[PDB]
Amino acid sequence: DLPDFPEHEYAATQQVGEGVINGDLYLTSASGAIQKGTNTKVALEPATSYMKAYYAKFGNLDAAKRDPDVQPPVLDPRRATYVREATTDQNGRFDFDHIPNGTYYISSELTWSAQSDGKTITEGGTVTKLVTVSGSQPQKVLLTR
Known about the structure:
By secondary structure, the chain is mostly beta strands. The protein has helices at 7-11, 49-58; strands at residues 19-28, 34-36, 41-46, 84-87, 93-99, 102-115, 120-133, 141-143. It is built from 2 helices and 8 strands.
């Protein structure tokens, strides 16, 4: 499962800042059609050894490829205070303000329904990337896979 919550790793992070993050969220259907993530929540949190272990198993996983017997574990309640959040607009665009200097996981979940042989298929899943912030203007994040 997950390692012990690393207090030192969270204590060493800068918790105040001026950085701006811009990006776009989308995934591709099995048919090749692009699906934009509209009015979808996007999370931005410190890139720790704790969340590296979590995102390895559940961060870039298709909903069709999920094990029904395997459920994601309950995370330490101390982690929530470090999570920043944004909702994408009508075009899948998201924005974050006052982002501190540091290294982060930027993560979202985008699923939708498709039809095939008269049966309903669940498409998409989770998508997670690394973003580094030094100065106030990092590059845009294309949150896709």
